[PDB]
Design a protein around this ligand. Structure first.
Ligand code: LJ1
Ligand code: LJ1
Lengths: 114, 114, 115, 115
């Protein structure tokens, strides 16, 4: 029910081998590790979770943008990109979190479908 | 070799049934019709052209954003969104033109791969 | 009543010396030249027009992004960024067209105010 | 040396009365409150800090987008927009953090200048 897609606005390409960490907000308001992986050759990270595990709650998707730019020999602005959202059962069932990266900027959108 | 993808930043969804027109710049500097279609349920328009037909040149992708917003009962700012670019044979072979739409803003990116 | 602001997402800076051409749709449906200029050291272009001259119409703001990236020695994707809009159709407004540039992507937004 | 600017992509207007909280990473790796405020009628928030107080560090600018869209009666996707960056590590700079908001999307950029 959760996919992450990362694109590179400098090169016009998928952002490949980017580390992505997902956290779930715990009852004590700390962030607990939930899922992680590296984006593929297509800039996508599939298979993070299952419908059973992905219960309603607040989630954070952290994208390791700084390492990505450093590997390309570029000095970037941000430490990482964060996307924080609530998963809601009455909304559509599948969430795609997309991020478009530049050295000093990023944009993100959610595509939520059934 | 050309795909167009359109997303809605207000609803968090693909932008469905959006008209898209592609033009090729002629030798007299006018824009000639090249390809057109309506985005699908996934917000994508596939099958616009073939490798044989998609020669080097300057192309314009016009997305009929105004009709899209009007159909949702929303008054938008732009008449349409335009994306104008050169197709180059020495670059990668497949072009995805992506647009993210809001009533008073849009963003676009190109993902060019082999 | 018309201002254009351009930022560079690679440098984290204003996009300076960007050429901007504005056109207005004529009665015969062609694009007539309306005004032009270049962004300053602040990435802003002021003074394109006056409230008298900026009548109702369909306007196109063409931002010459390829010339900007090539002047910097960089090969970008787009030829330019075009913003096309109806202006002043419920009376005079003030328009700021802002653009954020990367080599293979741009974002644009409008801020419309009623003086 | 720190300014935050927020625009609304639905209205084509400044995003007014948006709460912004800034944090700074402490020695113990926790986020310490640093400053806070609300955007004005222009969508800008000035006066968060001083050049003396804005020392080298890792800073987080949290823009309370959900409170903004809910204050407007709208149900948005994100809880907030977070911008996290190292500041002043090659000496004092001036930072503008700009954000463009939609219910299911946002864009942010930084303009970094050397006074
Ligand atoms: C312009 C833009 C494109 C994208 C890319 C969306 C996308 C999604 C699936 C396939 C290709 C592109 C993402 C964001 C956050 C953007 O601002
Ligand atoms: C198109 C756009 C404009 C803005 C606004 C930029 C800005 C900054 C200072 C003054 C005016 C506009 C911000 C972002 C993230 C954007 O994608």
């Amino acid at each position: 029910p959760l996919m992450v897609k990362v694109l590179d606005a400098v090169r016009g390409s998928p952002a490949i081998n980017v580390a992505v960490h997902v956290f779930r907000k715990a009852a004590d308001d700390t962030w607990e590790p939930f899922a992680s992986g590296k984006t593929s050759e297509s800039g996508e990270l599939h298979g993070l979770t299952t419908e059973e595990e992905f219960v309603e709650g607040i989630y954070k998707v952290e994208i390791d943008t700084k390492s990505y730019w450093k590997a390309l020999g570029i000095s970037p602005f941000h430490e990482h990109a964060e996307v924080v959202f609530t998963a809601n059962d009455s909304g559509p069932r599948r969430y795609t979190i997309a991020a478009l990266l530049s050295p000093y900027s990023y944009s993100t959108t959610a595509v939520v479908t059934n």
